[PDB]
């Protein structure tokens, strides 16, 4: 086998994402995806990736795998309500959004409330 | 180990420097050979004034991997933050040198200062 360092993969993707360099981002994250395929914390930075390149479905399903890799990671809820409001589901990114911030530290709280104030503007009956 | 550099890269994103400091040091103890682990830890360090523990972290990356821009870099700043500026042109070239080019810019600017205070 190719016997890969997905550590590094992982890391050079982080640098990928912090340059703005998103497809790259996405690349190193995939590679590192195949030698470590249960970190909610890979599948939550590449949903991210994702959604900053307005691959919304791609982010939604990557941050849905980060919630069944561990639902109690904030991030993991956070990406997929933000991608969901993207894809004009705002039923279902209100519950991943409360979800978020029940999980997240009190840093983050204050992000996701927003989100929710902007996903609560455009529900209606 | 891997865990903890993830824990340590979400609290060094969300400004919380002390506790990435804390959770790099423990994946550090874990795995000392990595230069992006040494990185982060010396960009943590020097975002809470930790001057010259940044530079030995940015130090031990450049000789884990010195072709990695980013350590030469981390050092260069810490470097000037201490009033070494010698040293720091010296880093500060080698990261030019080794940059992407979208780094470029930070290290032109970096250099400017640098030589401000020099020469």
């Known amino acids: 086998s190719p016997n890969l360092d ?61 919630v069944e890799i561990n639902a109690n990671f904030f991030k993991g809820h956070y990406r997929l309500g933000l991608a969901q409001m993207s894809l004009n589901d705002f039923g279902h990114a209100m519950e991943s959004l409360r979800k978020a911030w029940a999980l997240a530290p009190s840093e983050n709280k204050e992000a996701i409330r927003v989100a929710m104030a902007k996903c609560e503007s455009k529900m209606a009956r």
Do not use: C, M, W
Request: zero cysteines; hydrophobic letters at 35%; proline letters at 2%.
């Open 6 to 66: 997905g550590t590094r993969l992982r890391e050079e993707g982080n640098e990928a994402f912090k340059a703005g360099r998103y497809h790259e981002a996405i690349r190193y994250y995939t590679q590192a995806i195949e030698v470590d395929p249960d970190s909610e914390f890979l599948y939550t930075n590449r949903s991210f990736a994702y959604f900053n390149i307005k691959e919304f479905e791609k982010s939604a399903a990557d941050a849905a795998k980060a």
